[PDB]
Design a protein around this ligand. Structure first.
Ligand SMILES: O=C(O)CCC(=O)CF
Ligand SMILES: O=C(O)CCC(=O)CF
Ligand SMILES: O=C(O)CCC(=O)CF
Ligand SMILES: [K+]
Ligand SMILES: [K+]
Ligand SMILES: [K+]
Ligand SMILES: [K+]
Ligand SMILES: [K+]
Ligand SMILES: [K+]
Ligand SMILES: [Mg+2]
Ligand SMILES: [Mg+2]
Ligand SMILES: [Mg+2]
Ligand SMILES: [Mg+2]
Ligand SMILES: [Mg+2]
Ligand SMILES: [Mg+2]
Ligand code: NA
Ligand code: NA
Ligand code: NA
Ligand code: NA
Ligand code: NA
Ligand code: NA
Lengths: 323, 329, 323, 329, 323, 329
């Protein structure tokens, strides 16, 4: 407090003018904070609209390369790739995951060659490759087997490193998967490939639209009621070698972002998920909310402690920041 | 916890994109305040040898240069009048002259650039024959409360001239409260007070004394009875606590680079709007080295980034224009 | 706060007189805080001036011994040696580094014999010995190979211990190099040789003049924007066995010194680098700043939490402290 | 984290140079305050059997010895008058006598050694027939507020005599605020108040009582109704908080060595100028042991270093001259 | 603070009466806090006075058993044994240390048999058994060899456990000796033998009289200037398995006791050393200080955070507490 | 850090001597306060069925029993008058009757046992026809400030009777400050105020209501508008902070065992003299179980030790005599 008291202290003084608001402004969003998730199609010269994600398109790799030209020109530091697996590549083997000619691997090679400075974050998970939509070579009971699921994630991770990905991101919420991939990457010579852990991953309703986008929980994803638990999750991932840790979903979990940054003072990331994007975009299109909520929502992440934000608004935000 | 080689801190450093993602602090033009030395008269511009690249300017010239500063986005200027020798006195009356340089300059800038912040200097050092920041007793001691009376008159004259911020750099005890009371009583509800809270008795002020012309007046005189002992850190927290209690809208640590630890402690302890003055000597040291080819120009932004990393919200720096130019690229 | 309020509390009271200023003075610099870096030439009866470091001389070993007589008489506890490698001893083998007759090794033996109580801190690094100025048996891409660079640093470290150095200081910023040298020193019987880690080492412009002195970064040296990261760096070095940890450069990073001492309460050192020395010395010589800034700058390090300061002003400071 | 043998704490201890580099605290003469017992009369010097090496001195002799203390760099003395028996009374009026020993000694020292700090003792124990630090009621209880009235008069007389610091050792509640108010009202703006904040009801004061001549007056009397219970630590923090709020410039913990934990807590909690009195009994214990050949003289500096390590900024110690002499080497 | 202010708050109110002083009294010394160190002679029916420790006697084992009857009746929970080794049993072998018929071992057996509930803390150290007064099979340079010294301490520790000691206390300040003895005790089946580590052991002048008592430093004992260092020392001993940690000397280091208890919240002990005892006892005998300083000094240890106090005043204190 | 089997926590537990050495807390008689129910009249003793072993006593009988309590070392009693039904009223005037039971009992005990602490109860529940701790408005609400006026009169009457401590158990906002002001103004400088600070609206008070005879008056009435919601912990800290600011010498948490977490938080946050009342229901529960042979008598000391471990300095407990007896062995 410092015994600050009205009227000696009037907090409106600094708010009186733009210049003083700017001087005391505690946080600022910049393009350096933005990661753009992209849905990648197989094939050539194709784009598809996603009903529950207005404005977001699934893109074939050639189209991805065209759009990346502008993303790069805008300063967006990295993309997070999410392949849209053809149903015929799905299965049990769950081996389109480590397939060198799989969409993620092809997209990574293409982008790394064309835009060498652009960061590529690949998705380490099996569900986009399971006929049963499950992040595991599941058990005969339907429980997502933990350690066996981790086995799969490793070859996939190595395949991403082999394709040139600078960052692999296990989006799975299996216990101890960070250490396993880290060890594998180190043992294989991929010394500088980063591991972005989806550390505090909640069992959330906000993922709805993403499932629509990719064409695809309580026993592995965290209970939304729990906060302390998130700290234990992050601690474990850091101990296991993660270079960056993430809180998932974002705005509905800003308190978790704050606690995670405060507790560990580590590179902290946050995903503004499909559902968050869709509810904002829908309200803006309906004429219910001004466009300014986009930057307001992103500023919240910075204020809360996030270093980077995975957001489907990345291009629009970068354009506004440029302006 | 984190042990090598599971943890290799070089991974995030490997590439520009990851360095950008994890970068903890960034300097922007919103963090810059440009101090300016203001002359009397018309069409006057004077180079300062101990401050290479810095010029004293008459008000008309100040108005011309401000056009570029404003275009660059610099949010505020901090004005320092170069008082004519004949206007110095024992009573420092020129400090509250409605026609003093600081007052005239403020009125001119407020009219020409209404959105530009003007921070005036509340202190008697530019107006005394002896160069001390207050009024002297018969033993040569800078009287605290009697000095405050003059500082209050000065601050009121600045508010009347239209200054949005008055910045007491005097280091008298209790002056923030006295000034705040006076401002409130006079109806200057929104005039900010940027307290020079943890102001050190430093050797880094030399070039400024030349710039403003207080050097000859001060001679070999010191300010150890009011400016803080450089050895002291805890004392800084007590200084800031008092100024916040007394109504300051912003608190400042003075000099800058040689006191980054104080900036850090102050921001951490109080979570209040915190400044930091990169003083004349800091500017001169860096400029000298750059001009000799000893340091790359990049050191300017590195020095300024340090302030942000240390916890400062705003930086008084004679490099503000150069920095803003570099930032625009 | 303790509800301290003007005018019951007037902080100027203790400032009124020298005696009360002395009584409450929180920190004092002494000669026990000073480490003097020295540039050492090959050959005999030679000294060279360094254009960007006015007042600092490169010294042949015989000359170093002459000057050390006074450094020791002044109470300076330790020197940090930096050899000026002849271009013909440079290379790839990068093996002048562990050469028993290399400058550093020769200088160490000479000083240890003549001044047994004087601390000698040697520089564990390869760049002064690379034809390509790189702290590593570099890769074919130009990336400073981490683990392979560490291999080299070990024999060099052992060679320094073999020459009698009481402290070795890896100035390199390679991940996990402290543990490797510690293990090597322990395994070899050098139980009491100290390791002074350059822990929080920034990619800085302030090193300019040093490069001039020795005749010689973002992927290994730290981003000046980062503070939290410095804590993780120090933690790792302490876990790996460092006896002392250092923040590098100094004055532009005083906040880091403060955080490091507060967080770990370990022997903490700071380097007032060549650029800091040069900018101060230039201003003093130009008649822009009084000589008193030297002690002011050094006092700052103590106030900030430093136990020891590597400074090119060590002799001048010690002389003033003696006075 | 740190585990053997990666971490061997003996490494830094191996050599003098590394021990010096990592040494966390250092005692200097700037940390020393010398208490002195002052007699009435001329050419008087009296040995104190329970304080070997310490002498009571008349003012003329005090002035002579002070020459050496000042040459050694000792920043301040703390004066303790040895009140003549016939000047003791129920009302302790001698406490504020402008011609009392403390007042006369202060005037003499202020004139002879203008830079030397003089800390006077604000307390009524030397002036009462009963030896208590305040005025008694009909039940033999030391009245708080009535005592403060006398202490205020005393403190004002010290300020008038020129003392730069008054040090209330009385342990009345609220006396720091009362004295500060009085000093401020009288214009003694810069007179420091060194509060004996966490003052314990200790057995270590015996020799002092002999030195000052309050022993016979106090008899078997105690001070448990005002001096603190030695068992209490948290209470010390409340005592210091109040004295800071009330305006103390320095706060002190009393005795020293047997209360180093309190020094540590106080410095940690408040980050204010903290003192610590190495009392007569501490001095006597050490001196006795040294003179018997049981402890090496080195123990003097070890005892004083402890105070610095514990967090004290300044130490009242009867070893100040010896320490300063050893430090000069 | 809680905005407590005079005269609403008068701290003298609780001091007004004995009953309220008792109610708010924060700490109390009891016999449960006292450990009595005893100097043990070889032979029978002997006692010797120690010039620099007035009132303390060296005792032959039969005499020790006689005095222990009262120590036990007074409630003193434990003794710390210090044998007074005959010069002829001294040496190099330094093997009177692990001699089953050595004084410490004989005294332990005797006490354990006669007073089964009385705690016996033995001294693990070699110096009482070295002809050169050194806690190590020293080097040829005079440096107290660390690891080799630890070798000796282990058999001695086992010999104490074999004699029935419930607690062994390495008073040596060698790095990592706690782990070595712990491992040895565990490996040998001495599961419940406690290890009381002399953790923060200062190079002090206060040990003078003890050397007189037993008939016997900066490179192993801690610099009295250092406080943070004490925390690192204690942390290491706790990690190595110590059941109790000790600060040594006591009153001159009360701040360390406070920091150690606050930081680790572990069983914390403190030694009121020979020099502390002697200076108090001398002043009391000279008529300079009242006897009450004994309890005042011991109360300080409790207030500072000590759980147990090794003190030569234990009997006198226990007698007063009984009264 | 500590891992099995390097660390076996059972080692210190192996023997009584080591358990004693590491034992963190100890209960002593200095920690005990005995509440007593006082009857009007002469030679009256009445058993309380819901409080087995506890008797209401007339003053003459109280004086006789106090002889043993004092011999046992019990430092203080807390008096609770059993007000005759005909003395209850809307205005609770009996609360400040100089001839009320509490006042008479205090005078008698102060004369007979001058060193024994007497803590009187400041509250109107024993004196109102409705059993509430204050005065009611026309809506049946316990008026805060109007109640304070009566509590102040009561507290003054207790001070006049000689009580060393008044203990407001009313839970009106601001009453500690009002009472303190009144005590100070009247010259009762040293009368302690033991605030019932974090007083919960509990079901554990049943037997007390029987003991004092407020049960029939209260009927099914509640105190949720003034006593604290048992679910609330943070609120307790705000309650204590206010009472300390208002001048309380001691602060209390009420009930005890079911609120040990609050005792712990309160001691930790404020480091002030902290109490805790082991209430009638706690006593009854334990006594019932002991008498049924369900729990060993050892549970008494275990329950009391819990309070010390939780951070209490003193405990109000109807087991005080039994505990003191056991402690004497
Ligand atoms: O769609 C979901 O349930 C969340 C996405 C994942 O969990 C990816 F492996
Ligand atoms: O010159 C530099 O870049 C810093 C010096 C080092 O890094 C030494 F190995
Ligand atoms: O006498 C000393 O130096 C201390 C005693 C020890 O160190 C015991 F092994
Ligand atoms: K800003
Ligand atoms: K970022
Ligand atoms: K000092
Ligand atoms: K040092
Ligand atoms: K108690
Ligand atoms: K104990
Ligand atoms: Mg996990
Ligand atoms: Mg101030
Ligand atoms: Mg590192
Ligand atoms: Mg007080
Ligand atoms: Mg150790
Ligand atoms: Mg309340
Ligand atoms: Na996924
Ligand atoms: Na100024
Ligand atoms: Na280097
Ligand atoms: Na006194
Ligand atoms: Na020993
Ligand atoms: Na009640």
């Amino acid at each position: 407090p410092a015994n600050r008291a009205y009227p000696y202290t009037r907090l409106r003084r600094n708010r009186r003018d733009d210049f003083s608001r700017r001087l005391v402004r505690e946080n600022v969003l910049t393009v350096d904070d933005l990661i753009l998730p992209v849905f990648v199609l197989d094939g050539v010269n194709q784009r598809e609209s996603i009903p529950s994600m207005p404005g977001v398109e699934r893109l074939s790799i050639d189209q991805l390369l065209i759009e990346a030209e502008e993303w790069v020109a805008l300063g967006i530091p990295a993309l997070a790739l999410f392949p849209v697996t053809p149903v015929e590549k799905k299965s049990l083997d769950a081996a389109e995951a480590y397939n060198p000619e799989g969409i993620a691997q092809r997209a990574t090679r293409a982008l790394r060659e064309r835009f060498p400075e652009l960061g590529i974050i690949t998705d380490v998970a099996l569900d986009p490759f399971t006929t049963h939509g499950q992040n595991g070579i599941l058990d005969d009971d339907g429980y997502v087997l933990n350690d066996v699921s981790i086995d799969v994630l490793v070859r996939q991770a190595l395949s991403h490193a082999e394709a040139g990905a600078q960052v692999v991101a296990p989006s799975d919420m299996m216990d101890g998967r960070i250490g396993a991939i880290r060890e594998a990457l180190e043992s294989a010579g991929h010394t500088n490939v980063r591991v972005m852990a989806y550390s505090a991953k909640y069992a959330s309703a906000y993922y709805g639209p993403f499932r629509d986008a990719v064409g695809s929980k309580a026993t592995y994803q965290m209970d939304p009621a729990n906060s302390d638990e998130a700290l234990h999750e992050v601690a474990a991932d850091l101990a296991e070698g993660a270079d960056m840790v993430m809180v998932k979903p974002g705005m509905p979990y800003l308190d978790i972002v704050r606690r995670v940054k405060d507790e560990f003072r580590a590179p902290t990331f946050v995903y503004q998920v499909s559902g968050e994007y869709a509810m904002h975009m829908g309200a803006i299109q309906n004429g219910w909310l001004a466009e300014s909520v986009i930057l307001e929502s992103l500023t919240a992440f910075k204020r809360a402690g996030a270093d980077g934000i995975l957001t489907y608004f990345a291009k629009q935000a970068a354009e506004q920041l440029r302006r």
